[PDB]
Structure 1
Amino acid sequence: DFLPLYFGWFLTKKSSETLRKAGQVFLEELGNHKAFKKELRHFISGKEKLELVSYFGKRPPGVLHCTTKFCDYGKAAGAEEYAQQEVVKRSYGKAFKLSISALFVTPKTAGAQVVLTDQELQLWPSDLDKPSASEGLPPGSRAHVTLGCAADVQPVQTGLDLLDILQQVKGGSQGEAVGELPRGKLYSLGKGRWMLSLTKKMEVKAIFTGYYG
């Protein structure tokens, strides 16, 4: 009896359209921003302008999601232990509201930061060999929605990318906002990394369930 490929919160059609459009507008605004344009060298080693919607060409086709535990049908470490928790079984098929606090972009991925409630944090995995990228950071900090990936990148990168962006804000290194977009303040973390802090947290609805490929 096998597990899904992964468990996660799957956004409603409506919420996915909303966040998807938010991400795309952000990519069109970021790519046109003069602060971004003057840093293109720290972005692509390739003078004309980069179109980020095109740059992030591998995108989710339909509904968006926030992954909790990648299971690979039970091949992944901790997959069974995770799937067996009462809270997971109990939460299966239930609606949740997810709060997105920021949109981000690196040379590798574009995504949205999810800020989990403590209830939702109960559905966040407690891995038995923790990532040194994750470590130092409050649990669930890795929670995100993938918006796009560059050609050579696997969408699991997005999470590592977000933890990286946050490792720096932990060291108070985000620095001074270099711009004001209609939705929030634009931060340049360097190394091709960008973060938009939303003035107002987007709220999205999603169903907690398992995806089987």
Structure 2
Amino acid sequence: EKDFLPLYFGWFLTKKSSETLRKAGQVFLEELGNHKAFKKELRHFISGEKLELVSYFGKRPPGVLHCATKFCDYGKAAGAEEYAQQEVVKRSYGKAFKLSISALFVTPKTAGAQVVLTDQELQLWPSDEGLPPGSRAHVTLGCAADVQPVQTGLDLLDILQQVKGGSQGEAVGELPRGKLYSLGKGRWMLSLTKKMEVKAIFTGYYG
């Protein structure tokens, strides 16, 4: 009888760190919704007055927030066994880490936070494109009704791809904690003046 792996590995934020990022995320969806530049380009955000984004991203993580590394599906996913067998993964299991979050973003599908992993933390990132490894690292804050949390990372990569070309353009707003950027196609990004640090434990979720 074999030992099945978790649903996925990842950094799970503490109560206080989750509380902080959660409320910060809420404050962002409230300011963005009330903002002038957003109300203008609302046609490219919804096919259908004001839109309250906190309600729009109705599906939100219930307990503590997290930053996933490798989706394993208890060993069914490709490379799950290989990832879990790594010394660095087994060594890091249950240990605390400090994740740096550089920006919060919003798309028609998801709302999340961009994670900038350290070189130490990148060793825990699966190497199973076009952007540097770990660019997909994120914390999902919310999803639209028929969107799956896996979308959040994909949305982030799409936004970072627009940053490669430099389609970010000039900041279309100054929020209390950073500069607002309009990427188009209902995509928005808040570059934080100060990268907020969150405390999290690297472990495995079984669900």
Q: So what's the TM-score if we normalise by structure 2?
A: 0.97
What SS class does the counterpart of residue 38 from structure 1 fall into? helix
User: Residue by residue, what CA displacement relative to the aligned partner does 1:7-53 show, whole Å, maximum 9, x if unpaired?
Assistant: 0000000000000000000000000001000011000000x000000
Given the superposition, is the C-alpha separation of residues 171 and 185 from structure 1 closer, same or farther in structure 2, using an over 3 Å criterion? same
Cross-structure match for 1:205:
199
User: Residue by residue, what CA displacement relative to the aligned partner does 1:97-126 show, whole Å, maximum 9, x if unpaired?
Assistant: 0000000000000000000000000000xx
Whether the aligned pair in 2 keeps the contact of 1:134 and 1:142 (CA below 8 Å) is no
Separation of aligned partners in 2, 1:172 and 1:52: 26
Whether the aligned pair in 2 keeps the contact of 1:134 and 1:141 (CA below 8 Å) is no
Separation of aligned partners in 1, 2:102 and 2:141: 14
What SS class does the counterpart of residue 140 from structure 1 fall into? coil
Cross-structure match for 2:70:
69
Whether the aligned pair in 1 keeps the contact of 2:173 and 2:180 (CA below 8 Å) is yes
Unmatched 5+ stretches in structure 2: none
Cross-structure match for 2:15:
13
Whether the aligned pair in 1 keeps the contact of 2:79 and 2:128 (CA below 8 Å) is no
Separation of aligned partners in 1, 2:128 and 2:56: 27
Cross-structure match for 2:116:
115
User: Residue by residue, what CA displacement relative to the aligned partner does 1:60-87 show, whole Å, maximum 9, x if unpaired?
Assistant: 0010000000000000000000000000
What SS class does the counterpart of residue 166 from structure 2 fall into? coil
What SS class does the counterpart of residue 169 from structure 1 fall into? helix
Given the superposition, is the C-alpha separation of residues 36 and 134 from structure 1 closer, same or farther in structure 2, using an over 3 Å criterion? farther
User: Residue by residue, what CA displacement relative to the aligned partner does 1:108-163 show, whole Å, maximum 9, x if unpaired?
Assistant: 00000000000000000xxxxxxxx9911000000000000000100100000000
Given the superposition, is the C-alpha separation of residues 134 and 82 from structure 1 closer, same or farther in structure 2, using an over 3 Å criterion? closer
Whether the aligned pair in 2 keeps the contact of 1:184 and 1:199 (CA below 8 Å) is yes
Given the superposition, is the C-alpha separation of residues 170 and 160 from structure 1 closer, same or farther in structure 2, using an over 3 Å criterion? same
Separation of aligned partners in 1, 2:113 and 2:168: 17
Cross-structure match for 1:30:
32
Separation of aligned partners in 2, 1:187 and 1:40: 15
Separation of aligned partners in 2, 1:37 and 1:74: 45
Greater shift in the superposed pair: 81-90 or 134-143: 134-143
What SS class does the counterpart of residue 78 from structure 2 fall into? coil
Cross-structure match for 1:87:
88
Separation of aligned partners in 1, 2:99 and 2:167: 27
What SS class does the counterpart of residue 163 from structure 2 fall into? helix
Q: Percent identity?
A: 99
Separation of aligned partners in 2, 1:134 and 1:209: 19
Separation of aligned partners in 2, 1:167 and 1:205: 28
Given the superposition, is the C-alpha separation of residues 174 and 107 from structure 1 closer, same or farther in structure 2, using an over 3 Å criterion? same
Separation of aligned partners in 1, 2:42 and 2:148: 22
How many residues are treated as equivalent by the alignment? 204
Separation of aligned partners in 1, 2:112 and 2:156: 8
Whether the aligned pair in 2 keeps the contact of 1:56 and 1:150 (CA below 8 Å) is yes
Whether the aligned pair in 2 keeps the contact of 1:96 and 1:207 (CA below 8 Å) is yes
Unmatched 5+ stretches in structure 1: 125-132
Cross-structure match for 1:140:
134
Separation of aligned partners in 1, 2:128 and 2:72: 18
Separation of aligned partners in 1, 2:46 and 2:160: 22
